[PDB]
Subunit: 115 residues, 4 copies
């Protein structure tokens, strides 16, 4: 799995469970086309989004559906979703972990790219 | 000024200066969209993007051009840009500060929302 | 004002008001330490902690009393406080803004350091 | 292992490897007494700091030696170290993960507490 998404909850100090995540790849005409999606597990992680074969170089967008997450918890959120937009580059063997740490009015996100 | 954008640099410990910012508003057709744009000052702030009159209720996207920022400093960062998407003015007019703290492979963003 | 502390609330999207802040400076004996203290204003800022004269070179610790903050709002947070430890003025006088963005189980902190 | 420390590097987008971490427990006289220490692994993680038996309720401080980390990379840092101070509470079965995401002039830290 060249791509993994991990989401944490900064209010409860826990994995953010059952968060919907949609990934898109930018198409030639500049539009975003659906690529992969899923919901985070009990560990706050989403594995198996794509394969090495499918995850070619290109520009990708990872949308984390934070608004629904907070709504299900009865908490008023600011953002519609969190978005992470990046270019995947074939610089030797690499795995991409996109992490996000969520609060109602703020989030942090980072990439951990390893071989 | 009901909308202000502030950007900081976590590598240098300074305001992030000359960062391009583009704001979009979702249209009736569900497309993004252009609404306003500008660049951060020497204080890392961008004021005067809009007016109370023009900044009506809607879904807005603030795109902060982080890649251009890092590349102008000779660094190859991870993200294309930082995107902040939110509904504004759904309970009447508010003042919004959208802040972002930037590193080459990471960013954080928060909003401070006040009522005049 | 060579030292300013700013605190934001990531739950409410607001300045963190009335947050107690204690600053310490490492002494010759290697103990912390008292140096200055105060509380954030309605803007979430704490100015006037010290003067250019008193704020000499040294190792400083800014302790932000986050637990007291969250408990006064009826929340049980993870951390006792947020601690920011840094050497100041080692290359001559600078102006320091120490910022912290607070959530019940998390915080971020950054410094903006400028030269007058 | 009731306590794990994880450190990430926001400049390189990688685990922060070989970072020294010192844990202290607050003693009756209010002083901090050494409790456990180690260095993060290639995954940026530090496991095996303590046992269930030893990790009783109390106030703990986790010091992450960020200054030396940045110095070894030739990068000028702001902080002497990052410090995380918290009370451990016996509210049923719990594991504490203290995470920190490091930049030269900033860091974020969060707790993930799970059963
Ligand atoms: O996964 N993490 O450990 C972790 C910690 C702090 C963070 O701020 C983030 N982040 O920005 O996504 C991730
Ligand atoms: O505005 N600030 O001072 C400030 C501090 C820390 C932060 O993490 C952020 N942020 O996420 O945008 C902003």
């Amino acid at each position: 799995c060249p791509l993994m998404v991990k989401v944490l909850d900064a209010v409860r100090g826990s994995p953010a469970i059952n968060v919907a995540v949609h990934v898109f790849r930018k198409a030639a005409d500049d539009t975003w086309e659906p690529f992969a999606s899923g919901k985070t597990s009990e560990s706050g992680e989403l594995h198996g989004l794509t394969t090495e074969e499918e995850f070619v170089e290109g520009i990708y967008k990872v949308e984390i559906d934070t608004k629904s997450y907070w709504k299900a918890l009865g908490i008023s959120p600011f953002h519609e979703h969190a978005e992470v937009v990046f270019t995947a580059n074939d610089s030797g063997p690499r795995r991409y972990t996109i992490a996000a740490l969520l609060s109602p009015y703020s989030y942090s996100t980072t990439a951990v790219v390893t071989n």
